[PDB]
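Final report, closing paragraph on structural work. Over the funding period we assembled a curated collection of sequence-structure pairs, and we close with a single example.
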Amino acid sequence: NLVSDIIGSKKHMEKLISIIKKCR
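Its predicted structure, as stored:
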């Protein structure tokens, strides 16, 4: 269920992370 979206958030999140320090 949408519970997956939460997980898939981690997804775009990890990219967001790889991004965070990237963009900083």
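The two ends are 33 Å apart (CA to CA). Helices lie at 3-23. We thank the funder for supporting this effort.
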